[PDB]
From a paper:
[name] virus-like particles have multiple properties that make them ideal for use as nanocrates. They are expressed and isolated in high yields and are amenable to controlled disassembly and reassembly around cargo proteins by a simple pH-dependent protocol. Disassembled [name] coat proteins can be stored at 4^°^C for at least a day and at -80^°^C for several months without losing reassembly and encapsulation efficiency. Briefly, we purified [name] capsids from *E. coli*, performed disassembly in an acidic solvent with the removal of packaged viral RNA by centrifugation, and reassembled the capsid proteins at neutral pH in the presence of ApoF.
Residue numbers in the entry:
A (entry chain B), B (entry chain A), C (entry chain C), D (entry chain C), E (entry chain A), F (entry chain B): 1 to 129
């Protein structure tokens, strides 16, 4: 069941979607990027390992470009002003079954579902109030 | 209106859904828990801070328990056999607009969407290949 | 093309086969893991290195679990009651051609072929008699 | 009955097979040797012992020669230009039944089956890619 | 689709072409080798890394052998009389777009094109004058 | 057989080609540049020397400008953000004949030919996957 394929990272109803495609598999770490320069592209990486005696850990990283007023193909500096970073670590005990892992995935999806508090706060440049 | 509201963490289609409700805001950490004992409850936390002069950082954590009943000294107690921990750190430059932040939210949602590589690998107890 | 793919480790006809899938390639050691709980999964690893100026060495390891349920204090967990460990080291001189390597592989396959003395002894909990 | 018998180590169809025959059983180590000159012969050894209170350990070794003629000072001798060495160690707990042992053997056979990643890498003078 | 595929390293017009095929990806170094013994094979390697915060570096190496048969201790062995080594280091800023990278590739191709000064000098065992 | 002449570094089908012409021969090092400012020009250099007792080494360097969003004739800073560098070293044993050197040139051409893995990865801002 090979799964290292391109997917839609940002869905805009079919027009203007952001697709990321496989770009690197060095050291077993899967990497996806959008069709941009490295400084302006969406980037996804994912790897999993045995973190401890009784846990496995997925390490998932995402880079998102700032798009308002950007210059496509231009040199934008400083780098830290134009990019957002997501660092996500999922620790799962070795006892978890496929059913348990499906539940964990549902928890993450529900956490980030549109209309829920956490995505609402992020989208509104706000905290919890 | 306040964004500190209850939400469905695990959507099972209306029956057996896991709901978490606001439970604490002490020390600037927003907390949600399911309607269980503290030993067996699901848990969600979220905080935001000015990590540096030009970036803001969200710190989001989720705990998924595997519930069980443990006999301690001849008495049965509600415990969690183990817990799965999700840790998300999201750094956003102060220059990001609301539309830029909406892109970040859509990227995360698309990352975890059903059928996409990363959730499929997690649900299947496997890496990406 | 790529040989870091899913494969059938235990061929139980067509139904009930044990399949292992790539999970990790850290430090140049490829790792395959079967699905469901990691505590009960099969494990295969393989690495190759230049052991001397004239020799290359393959290191291959396989773990076969005995699946069981552990119950301690009323808490049930899926575990391996015990595991069987295979450690293989194969040294091949740099002078060997593709034809020579194919012959070496045939030797290993013939060593473990059904009806032959060594697989028969292993399958019968027996030595050589 | 007896498993200390002649067997086909390399199966080259029906003509040109490499057959090894019992030669020695000293110190509880069974040894098979192919025919013709010993300097060029294939070698297989196998022994089993109680490695710990709960484990039995098989030690299996195979030598594959590259046949050649050595000429020193006009004197010709049949030799092996070099040899490939396989060393296998298999540990099986005393609790394993005959069914469990048959499963372990199937795992080894499936590991080395044609088309699978590890035999393919060996036959192609290659690693995992 | 994966870009880790076999390719014709030396094009002789369809007869006598030298083909290299994927052979290893351990430690993040992609390797190709020809269908020969390791002592006589052609070799290609390629890796990419973030050399600094704003540049990426490709490291590409090729080995071209001059094959021969060497008598060592009265036994003939396949060796390389000597090897020619090509080492390429290519540094690209993160701000380069795909079109910018295509220009880099075209520049290298035009540099080595038949009839151009540098390949002519190399083929003629001479410098540029 | 003088060979220090202008050549087409980037071929765009006859219209828009990038030609580089001789611009310096100090210290015996041949240099070509395009018709631009030094900060925005294509630049090629080549020299050859006796690197060791049994090897000669060609040192070939190429500089390629970033063209997307450039400003022709403008001051573009920092320099490292607008230019890509190729450093290529070809080591050839003194025993190699003209025929051997022609084969080496073919190897380089095949390495960089359109549609092959290495140029494909570079053009797509990607590694090997």
């Amino acid at each position: 069941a090979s799964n290292f394929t391109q997917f839609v990272l940002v869905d805009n109803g079919g027009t203007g979607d952001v697709t990321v495609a496989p770009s690197n598999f060095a050291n077993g770490v899967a990497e996806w990027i959008s069709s941009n320069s490295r400084s302006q592209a969406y980037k996804v990486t994912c790897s999993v390992r045995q973190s401890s005696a009784q846990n496995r850990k997925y390490t998932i990283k995402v880079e998102v470009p700032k798009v308002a007023t950007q210059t496509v193909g231009g040199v934008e500096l400083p780098v830290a002003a134009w990019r957002s970073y997501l660092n996500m670590e999922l620790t799962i005990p070795i006892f978890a079954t496929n059913s348990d892992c499906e539940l964990i995935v549902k928890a993450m999806q529900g956490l980030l579902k549109d209309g829920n508090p956490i995505p609402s706060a992020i989208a509104a440049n706000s905290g919890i109030y």
